[PDB]
Design a protein around this ligand. Structure first.
Ligand SMILES: *Cc1cc2c(cc1C)nc1c(=O)[nH]c(=O)nc-1n2C[C@H](O)[C@H](O)[C@H](O)COP(=O)(O)OP(=O)(O)OC[C@H]1O[C@@H](n2cnc3c(N)ncnc32)[C@H](O)[C@@H]1O
Ligand SMILES: *Cc1cc2c(cc1C)nc1c(=O)[nH]c(=O)nc-1n2C[C@H](O)[C@H](O)[C@H](O)COP(=O)(O)OP(=O)(O)OC[C@H]1O[C@@H](n2cnc3c(N)ncnc32)[C@H](O)[C@@H]1O
Ligand SMILES: CCCCCCCCCCCC[N+](C)(C)CCCS(=O)(=O)O
Ligand SMILES: c1ccc2oc(-c3ncc[nH]3)cc2c1
Ligand SMILES: c1ccc2oc(-c3ncc[nH]3)cc2c1
Ligand SMILES: O=C1Nc2ccccc2C1=O
Ligand SMILES: O=C1Nc2ccccc2C1=O
Lengths: 499, 494
């Protein structure tokens, strides 16, 4: 119970921090509230599915830290199926396509859609990844919701509806719930609009064979009995020489430093002595997590592939319970399955139903989208509503409502005496993901090595070599994508020519 | 150890709940985190100020529960001074006035201001006090911020600036931080724009002689050793026959029911077994409290009165640290003082200064606005930054960002097995105030009495006779206020 560092939380970020500190020769303890490690990742194993990721699952190019960590732990990836055509279902009909966005044929609509994605990335380039409150128009952008920004930018309903689906799927929240500054930061710090939304060459390209929960489980194996499960932390006292960390089951740990590797608002579950400084005290009441039910419907065969659909469906409309799906069949071609997300207000609205009722609605939806009666014949179903988790608060990650990132964002990873902050939310590249978890856990561990005098300051932040297994292709645009006007730019050109 | 009901929190709402249950003959225990009672009320006593409310202070007409409770405990009120002129300071100049809003002379700006207040109250009449998510346009109004609503309604910058001040002072938050539905509900459930903003015949009319902390202290006097200080609740377990409530100092209490009388989000500091239901688990991460420093500058005399000013100042503009003040002099004309609030982002901005640096900024601001060098000679200063408080989370109260009240509002006062929810945030009239704390603590206590079969369902919510000491006068409007067109109304006649 005496150690160098207590890590509070045994998700990927606390496990990555604990491993680094252990590898450097320090004595670490990880206090995990649950009876398992992995946190917002959770790999269920049973005979009907073999294994299935019910939390975080996908990785992709440019996520080099999780790929390197997982590789070193003996894990392998495989590519999510994107051989056959994607489907965009809009106004009750399905339109097959290939590429990052469904094709738009109407020239006016085309300009508006082109301008929308272009402008999201243009604004993102004004926003520093490590300091979004330093953007030149940070206040103006943080004081409006994403809804207000789509209202201003989108001169077509078509573009506004697609943009809405994009926000809801990327951050499991509604356009009117989230700040425009924070959402534009969140997309740019993932590499931009194409990279975040893509399967091939993007965030959803791959999964781990056997499930992502193995990352945290295999580090727990390396650490032995240093991971204490069912130890929720209730109290941290920094008034004396060594920090004292108390758990709910009545144990006391003493350490030189602590890393908090839990979602920022879950800091509220810990009583602090002395009290936190004013800005962190209020920050942790201002930063909710989003809302999602991850649902996986199993079938005898991946029947959609025979119709030349890959299983990816972008599904618009209020009545659809799931707005986005991917094929979740095993790489061997068996345990055929569709993964779908029930997003944001729908996660709250449909949580009232039973599991069997949600399975029925999802099969009825997929049968219509795929024009396939076979979708009404599931062989098994698994789901997880992350809104119910006391020790997560939601999924995938924390969002910032209007006005909060500029006022309180500076303190998200600011140390509090001998407490340092990990967790994906404090990352600067793919924050909200497993990648951001590794970045933040290793960065917080190195802050402590630096505090101890073990490494110089310039080693706190460390670049990551690009994976040789999952290389990234650049995201490119065409001259016409770059230079074609927006709708109001065209109207300005028309008004001028009319003169 | 064992009792009928454990009340978590010894603010006014927890105290009022515990007193009601105690008076009905149950065994109650109050578990208070701090080494004091009163919560968001705090009355400091020293020789320089005699006493000063550093937290909640004001009561007024229509707040009959807090007036009845305090009168039963032996307290008296006095009137906040409003005899002389009020000041609106705009663009670096003071304009003295009387009445609920500063006069506007430009005919366009007049229409724009008149329509703004009128439209806030018109909207409020469609929002049920006890279920604002049932307003006919609930979703539409909940999905916009107040800044977006003000941008829509205000055709002049003058109106928009005064509306901004009004939102910042009522709910200690910025217009772009809050939902329009929730803000409109908040004003309506205090009786509308005139009643919430007014001193005479409104929410700021009176203060308690000796301080409002005396309400919580005097109920603690009654309950004696039933109130346990420095007992932060850390864990609530309802998986067994009786509810088990555990504190940080390693004590265990067992009860038939619990009342949670703490700000909603501070339910995060309690680990629940079984876990909370999904909607409350997320709700209590979505409901922050506002930000405010309350500052009281003392002087040898209430010198502003010689100049026919009462000490109320509405001060616009970014550079002013304090946007609103009231005279805090004691009823006897002594301990002269001005109370001012540093609101919302300015509480965040100015909290980095020292106490003496804040005093200097305040005094230079008041010298400009009162047009008196006497404001530069303070004799004493007290202040409290509520943003620092672990066991409040901010002041005055909890605000709802866009989208949260329609999605989660129904859960605020929904019982969770044998836990019932008090706290001013759960009230239906003057929620956010000491009056809403009494209403909610007494109603939560009565839900428990009904669960015990002690009273019928219809006695859970109880009306309150009007105070004889602080009666309400009607809020009226003129024919012109009712019927003058808005700016886009006047343009639909051109
Ligand atoms: C839930 C989810 C997440 C998700 C996703 C789909 C869903 C449904 N899709 C993802 C994807 O495909 N690819 C990806 O990279 N990420 C995706 N996510 C997000 C991902 O799961 C999270 O970003 C990442 O797992 C976060 O890791 P981090 O280590 O930062 O945080 P955590 O997993 O929440 O771990 C925190 C641990 O702390 C324990 N805890 C909480 N409170 C306490 C206290 N008081 N004491 C001790 N331990 C505590 C939690 O139990 C948890 O284990
Ligand atoms: C801070 C403030 C508030 C205020 C105001 C000015 C300021 C600066 N102006 C007011 C005014 O003039 N007139 C008025 O009526 N109200 C005004 N307010 C708000 C008013 O103070 C609040 O509405 C009222 O005091 C709220 O009472 P309530 O009883 O609902 O809430 P509380 O005071 O916060 O008490 C909660 C108690 O719970 C204890 N606590 C917190 N967590 C725990 C745990 N885990 N375990 C045990 N106890 C806990 C708190 O310490 C507190 O005592
Ligand atoms: C005789 C000429 C009359 C034509 C007047 C043109 C009216 C233009 C209003 C269309 C609003 C379009 N959206 C995208 C909703 C908002 C744009 C925001 S921004 O205006 O670009 O800032
Ligand atoms: C809005 C909402 C969901 C979306 O998914 C894609 C996508 N998936 C794979 C390639 N592009 C694009 C897209 C746009
Ligand atoms: C906006 C912001 C603060 C304000 O204070 C008043 C007021 N005080 C007492 C009578 N009216 C009116 C008013 C309007
Ligand atoms: O699982 C997912 N997480 C995501 C984040 C952004 C966009 C798509 C997805 C997924 O499909
Ligand atoms: O203390 C105050 N609380 C208030 C709430 C609304 C309007 C004015 C005030 C005050 O002056």
């Amino acid at each position: 119970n005496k150690c160098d560092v207590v890590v509070v939380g045994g998700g990927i970020s606390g496990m990555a921090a604990a491993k680094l500190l252990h590898d450097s020769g320090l004595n670490v303890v990880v206090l995990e509230a649950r009876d398992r490690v992995g946190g917002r990742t959770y790999t269920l194993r049973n005979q009907k599915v073999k294994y299935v990721d019910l939390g975080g699952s996908y990785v992709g190019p440019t996520q080099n830290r999780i790929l390197r960590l997982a590789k070193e732990l003996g894990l392998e990836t495989y590519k999510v199926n994107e051989v056959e055509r994607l489907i965009h279902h809009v106004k009750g009909k399905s339109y097959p396509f290939r590429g990052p966005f469904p094709p738009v044929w109407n020239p006016i609509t085309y300009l508006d859609h082109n301008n929308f994605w272009r402008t999201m990335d243009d604004m993102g380039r004004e926003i520093p990844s490590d300091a979004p409150w330093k953007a030149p128009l940070a206040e103006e952008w943080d004081n409006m919701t994403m809804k207000e920004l789509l209202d201003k930018l989108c001169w077509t309903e078509s573009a506004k509806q697609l943009a809405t689906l994009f926000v809801n799927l990327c951050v499991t929240a509604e356009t009117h719930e989230v700040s425009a500054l924070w959402f534009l930061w969140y997309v740019k710090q993932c590499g931009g609009t194409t990279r975040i939304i893509s399967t091939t060459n993007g965030g959803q390209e791959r999964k781990f064979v056997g499930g992502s929960g193995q990352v945290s489980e295999r580090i727990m194996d390396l650490l032995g009995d240093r991971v204490k499960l069912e130890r929720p932390v209730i109290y941290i006292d920094q008034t004396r020489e060594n920090v004292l960390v108390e758990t709910l089951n009545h144990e006391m740990y003493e350490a030189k430093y602590v890393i908090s590797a839990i979602p920022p608002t879950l800091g509220m579950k810990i009583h602090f002595n002395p009290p936190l400084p004013m800005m962190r005290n209020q920050m942790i009441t201002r930063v909710p997590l989003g809302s999602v039910i991850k649902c996986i419907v199993y079938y005898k065969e991946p029947f959609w592939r025979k119709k030349d659909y890959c299983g990816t469906m972008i599904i618009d409309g209020e009545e659809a319970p799931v707005a986005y799906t991917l094929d979740d069949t095993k790489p061997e071609g068996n345990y055929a399955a569709i993964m779908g997300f029930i997003l944001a207000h729908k996660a709250r609205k449909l949580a009232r139903l039973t599991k069997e009722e949600r399975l029925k609605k999802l099969c009825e939806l997929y049968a219509k989208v795929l024009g396939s009666l076979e979708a009404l014949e599931p062989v098994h179903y698994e789901e997880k509503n992350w809104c119910e988790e006391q020790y997560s608060g939601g999924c995938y990650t924390t969002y910032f409502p209007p006005g909060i990132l500029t006022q309180y964002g500076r303190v998200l990873r600011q140390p509090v005496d001998r407490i340092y902050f990990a967790g994906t939310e404090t990352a600067t590249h793919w924050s909200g993901y497993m990648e951001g978890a590794v970045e933040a856990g290793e960065r917080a561990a190195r802050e402590i090595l630096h505090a101890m005098g073990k490494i110089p300051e310039d080693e706190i932040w460390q670049s990551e070599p690009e994976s040789v297994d999952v290389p990234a292709q650049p995201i490119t645009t065409t001259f016409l994508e770059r230079h074609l006007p927006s709708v109001p730019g065209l109207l300005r050109l028309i008004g001028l020519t009319t003169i």
